Amino acid sequence: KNIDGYFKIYSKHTPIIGRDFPQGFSALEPLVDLPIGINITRFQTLLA
Amino acid sequence: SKFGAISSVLNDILSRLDPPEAEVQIDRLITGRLQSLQTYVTQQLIRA
Amino acid sequence: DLCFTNVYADSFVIKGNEVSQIAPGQTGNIADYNYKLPDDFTGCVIAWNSNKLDSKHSGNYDYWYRLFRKSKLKPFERDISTEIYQAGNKPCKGVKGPNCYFPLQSYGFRPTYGVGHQPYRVVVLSFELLHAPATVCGPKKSTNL
Amino acid sequence: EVFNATRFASVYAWNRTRISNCVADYSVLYNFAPFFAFKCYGVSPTKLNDLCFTNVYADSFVIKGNEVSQIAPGQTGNIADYNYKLPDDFTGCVIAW
Ligand SMILES: *[C@@H]1O[C@H](CO)[C@@H](O)[C@H](O)[C@H]1NC(C)=O
Ligand SMILES: *[C@@H]1O[C@H](CO)[C@@H](O)[C@H](O)[C@H]1NC(C)=O
């Protein structure tokens, strides 16, 4: 998210059941809070 | 009752002045109206 | 004697009346197309006249300001762009002159203007007073707990 | 009537027209003249149709090209000193076509 800049990244990694997007609850641990403060409108991801 | 503000119409105050200056007036309106509601509620409690 | 999580310093040169203009939530083309502060702003604005660095003989037209913008400016937004403002319905975008005006106009300064037209230099200090690990302090003593 | 005139006065004797008791729609000026200088100082050129003005003066005078840039608040020149001088606290717009 990019509220007033300050880019935030959230992650919680677990070998969950592994079928797909699961049902059991899971909180999210922050990793980095970084104040970017730039314009942001589109999204894309990089592969291997 | 204007309660000591510019006007008794919240929507008029909003559409006429900027946020950070109409803020004092709308806060005055809140302090008046909520306190009046408090008197009403207390009197209703006594009657009840 | 305070601790702030992060400090942002924004700097720009603006005219004397615009010092009165620049404030949280005001009106005027600079306040709505050039720079806008949040309503709940927590910081300081610093203004001092600079007629020795922004003025020279024959004038100096280096600086700029925007007057033509499609909408209002969201707080802390770098809307830097050179797009002709549309007037009426003509898609212009090709030629200057009638109903095709530039979004920004020269901020020409000369050593001989009025006080309201002098080259004031403005920097604004923004602070974040929230419950978060700070980075900046002042005088300190580290008495044992 | 101030834009469709045929004898716009000279700068030395600038006719000053008083405008009152009317709805100031600016599309009528927009469609009448292919402007070349629509610089506004006190108000926004986009924001003219949402403000109510106590009184409006329309001073019209034909002048040279560079004199268009000459005419502005806090300016100087043979016209800006002897023919017409714009006040520094000028709340209004100029139109040049
Ligand atoms: C900033 O991002 C918003 C979000 O879409 C966009 O509307 C605006 O034009 C952007 N400003 C720029 C790119 O200057
Ligand atoms: C003058 O009025 C006529 C009639 O409405 C119109 O066709 C013409 O464009 C106008 N010219 C100016 C300069 O306003």
Ligand SMILES: *[C@@H]1O[C@H](CO)[C@@H](O)[C@H](O)[C@H]1NC(C)=O
């Ligand atoms: C202003 O006065 C001049 C004097 O020559 C005249 O030509 C012009 O038509 C007048 N403008 C008006 C009455 O709008």
